[PDB]
Symmetry: D2
């Protein structure tokens, strides 16, 4: 079922918290990006001594997937060690809008099983696109 | 009046379109960031041969203002040569959320006088903050 | 410095796989670990140009996400008359994860190449030591 | 290379002005134009670390937004035992707007300094030539 699959994706994103490279913030974030073909891509945040070159977990998952030729995504899970479900930052929301349909579901996870259901469009309303370039 | 001030800010953002450094996209964006003290900061997008080091007009305005000690913002105008009012990208929305109140008004401008009224919260719902760091 | 044709092939083959709808300027990377495992990178652009990710960083983000921490070589290729140059942001990510002396091979069109290292590309590198 | 105390003062004074609630690691910059006009930079962090902007880039974004295109010197200061090092991203922005030979002065605590140039900090610099 869709709910049982979502729990395996949640597990993938939560396990990513243990793989994060965060020696400066000590704030791990995990992601599970799911393709239309069923393949999952796990993302971690990856920091840099120069903070601005840090890459978020959500973007790591997209860059992994897109590098393998993936262009059709059906779900994204993001997890954090947070009392409420973790929130993707605006930069990640913009990468999500580049590759995903507006109505693609996004599940946000925090500690102690808390979750929030949303979509790409709800996280980034009136999204900037390539339309006018 | 608030509406007459908003038109001077709109003019500032539109004039910024002529100052943009966009030799690669040729897509200028202008910004007018207004402080509680009445001071305005004009932003332009500034590209780099390595595209990822490009800085948006909205962020240029914030970096100018914050570098002068500004921490209290009351309005942001963003303008583009676009048929509908220009949309700030997610990265800019995240910088807006760092420094602005959720309900701070944002005016988006396109060509031929088209405008859209919104706020920091509406552009970036459920915003990620420093709360859990 | 050792240079395997597989590594060159990995970086050049990536040129056809890049996500570059805005620049049409593909960049390819092959990042090699101590075990010999290879990670291919492509540049991945965004309608907001400043969210673009370079091929070199894509390769590092892939490898680091799989737990790799020991790198022995990086090949970078472009469709360029001289060997392609990694940008400064990529050089800083390379310095995060690689030894100063780790070899780097830069490739352009028609077989032009240039051999260098992490330290030569980023002298007097900024590190975390004073944070 | 000419070095004015005003420029050093501008970069060091910026250390007290930085927006660094996450690292508490301030960086200051003084960017000088041909006309002698100076632009002060600070690093400006973000709760999402990857949206942080460096002091060097803040100075360039300020100057370029005011129409400046001719730069003659960059001073960068940190509270560091050795002169602070610009990160690779900053070096790439410097290469966008500065001559290869434009002088750069790096400053640390207790008056330690190091003189360099844009080209020495970013050898074999990537440019727009093949786009
Ligand atoms: O959307 C987001 C927002 C933040 N993070 C990570 O939080 C830490 C502190 O910023 C950094 O390592 C990070 F990369 F920004 C994500 O992974 N995704
Ligand atoms: O929010 C935004 C989104 C895009 N832009 C600019 O559009 C051009 C094409 O991406 C680039 O120069 C730019 F910087 F990204 C902004 O200025 N602000
Ligand atoms: O070091 C580098 C420098 C540039 N590129 C790519 O060139 C295009 C134009 O900037 C963008 O798509 C890109 F990502 F920045 C790399 O992949 N690596
Ligand atoms: O070149 C550089 C390298 C780092 N910094 C600043 O150091 C802190 C920790 O990375 C961040 O606040 C910062 F912005 F990246 C600069 O200002 N310039
Ligand atoms: Zn993010
Ligand atoms: Zn933006
Ligand atoms: Zn790069
Ligand atoms: Zn920097």
């Amino acid at each position: 079922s869709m709910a049982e699959l979502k729990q395996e994706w949640i597990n993938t994103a939560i396990e990513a918290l243990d793989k994060a490279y965060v020696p400066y913030s000590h704030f791990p974030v995990g992601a599970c990006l799911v393709t239309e073909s069923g393949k999952i891509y796990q993302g971690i945040n990856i920091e840099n001594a120069s903070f601005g070159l840090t890459n978020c977990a959500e973007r790591t998952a997209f860059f992994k997937a897109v590098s393998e030729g993936e262009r059709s995504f059906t779900h994204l899970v993001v997890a954090g060690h947070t009392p409420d479900p973790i929130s993707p930052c605006g930069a990640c929301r913009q990468v999500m809008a580049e590759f995903c349909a507006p109505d693609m579901p996004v599940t946000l996870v925090g500690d102690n099983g808390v979750t929030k259901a949303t979509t790409v469009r709800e996280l980034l309303p009136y999204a900037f696109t390539e339309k006018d370039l």
